[PDB]
Amino acid sequence: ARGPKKHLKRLAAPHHWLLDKLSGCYAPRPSAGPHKLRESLPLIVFLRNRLKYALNGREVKAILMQRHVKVDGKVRTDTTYPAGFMDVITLDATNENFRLVYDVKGRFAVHRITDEEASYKLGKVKKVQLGKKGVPYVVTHDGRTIRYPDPNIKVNDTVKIDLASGKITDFIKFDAGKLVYVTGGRNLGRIGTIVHKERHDGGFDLVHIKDSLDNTFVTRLNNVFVIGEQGKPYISLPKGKGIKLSIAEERDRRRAQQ
């Protein structure tokens, strides 16, 4: 439409932000950033509709502008910045550190953690190439662009980063039998320990994935996110850890605590 869009109505904003269909006919458009529009949680909806730390967008803008807030160790004083997947946010006041991960019900969770657990994160490599002057480099899922990594690091691997620089603390390779996390689709929030995969040369490599109740499924290799080895996650995980129990067990569950 004659140029880029700038506005966003409600009901075109995604579902998993859980924004209400009343309260004004406009929605927060994620300004461009290190994550996409849809698989991203803006800081306005974060502070205003996950924590209730503010009540009005002016107040959230007040907080972000007076710099009580900081994501990835930087203030980031824009009201509609995409706080995407896996990312870290640090609040000096209350000394909290939120981590942005998924839950099995298909929503952006709120993962409370400490300052040292904030100082490292995880990032799936999105691709690898050779930059100018013969400098091999890679680029992750959070717009982070990193130079001179290990030659062992190839595509679909994961890296653990220092957050004071963009350099690497260490890496994790891709192979059969590694703990993962899913990000995209019906499987949003699962945690499922690779059993095998399949190639289909020409497009759409698929991966067989199962969580610890033996329960399996299949997902696209660009929707998965590998988090380490079986047993230990490399980070802390939210309540449930990606299981997707039945509807009836959860009804009975709620009827047990009431």
Partner 1 sequence: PRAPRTYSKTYSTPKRPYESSRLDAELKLAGEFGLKNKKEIYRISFQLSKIRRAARDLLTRDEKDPKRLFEGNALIRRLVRVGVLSEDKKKLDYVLALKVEDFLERRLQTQVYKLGLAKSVHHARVLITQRHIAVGKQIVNIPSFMVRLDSEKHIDFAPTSPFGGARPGRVARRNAARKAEASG
User: From the list RNA, partner 1, none, which binds 246 (C-beta under 5 to 8 Å, kind-based)?
Assistant: partner 1
Could you say whether residue 210 binds RNA (CB under 7 A)? no
| Contacts of range 23-32, beta carbons closer than 8 Å, 24 or more positions apart | 28/57, 28/79, 28/80, 29/5, 29/80, 30/80, 30/81, 30/82, 31/78, 31/80, 31/81, 31/82
Which C-beta is closer to partner 1: that of 10 or that of 76? 10
Q: What is the number of H-type helices and E-type strands within the chain?
A: 4, 18
User: From the list partner 1, RNA, none, which binds 14 (C-beta under 5 to 8 Å, kind-based)?
Assistant: RNA
Q: Which residue has the tokens 């959230």?
A: 60
3-state helix, strand, coil split of the chain in percent (to 5) is 15, 30, 55
* Interacting residues with partner 1 (CB under 8 A): 9-11, 21-22, 25, 246-248, 251
- Residue 187, helix vs strand vs coil: coil
Which C-beta is closer to RNA: that of 28 or that of 192? 28
**The total number of residues written for the chain in this structure:** 258
Could you say whether residue 229 binds RNA (CB under 7 A)? no
Could you say whether residue 162 binds RNA (CB under 7 A)? no
Q: Whole-number minimum distance, CB 246 to partner 1, in Å? A: 7
Could you say whether residue 11 binds RNA (CB under 7 A)? yes
Which C-beta is closer to partner 1: that of 24 or that of 231? 24
User: From the list partner 1, RNA, none, which binds 241 (C-beta under 5 to 8 Å, kind-based)?
Assistant: none
Could you say whether residue 93 binds RNA (CB under 7 A)? no
The residues near 224 (Cβ < 8 Å, ≥ 6 apart) are: 180, 181, 182, 183, 207, 209
Among 92, 114, 162, 166, binds RNA (CB under 7 A): 166
- Burial of 177 from C-beta contacts in 10 A (0-12 / 13-18 / 19+): exposed
Please give the residues from 113 up to 152 whose contact with RNA meets the rule CB under 7 A: 126-134, 136-137, 139, 143-147, 151
Q: Whole-number minimum distance, CB 140 to RNA, in Å? A: 9
